[PDB]
Design a protein around this ligand. Sequence first.
Ligand code: BR
Ligand code: CL
Ligand code: ZN
Length: 145
Amino acid sequence: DKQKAINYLMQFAHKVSGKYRGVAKLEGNTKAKVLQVLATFAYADYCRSAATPGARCRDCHGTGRAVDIAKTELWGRVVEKECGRCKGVGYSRMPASAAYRAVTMLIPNLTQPTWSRTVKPLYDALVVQCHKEESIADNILNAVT
Ligand SMILES: [Br-]
Ligand SMILES: [Cl-]
Ligand SMILES: [Zn+2]
């Protein structure tokens, strides 16, 4: 069930919600609903971009990152750098306005520039979180062992 995936993304949203002031201070019920909406639109945004030619950078597949070979070897652990191809952008940011409208149903006083600064970053963190997940699983499935 994809609800399981959206809910898992929602659990993550709740964990990092403290970093975003637009959500960190909401009443419990409202916060839960807002995170549910962000998780639901972010996931749909991820899915669409992955199945749509050109919607994701073809080098990083949405993460906007690449492995720094030298540093990974130096530090004995995976060290990442920006993906040059998309300059770290990874996916289109246009789908976010639909999510903004949905969130305004819950926080009616929220303006777009305020959402942009205090809530949207959480939305984007959830979208890239999905790309990163896919990438890690990819690395795992195709590891020359
Ligand atoms: Br998920
Ligand atoms: Cl937006
Ligand atoms: Zn890229």
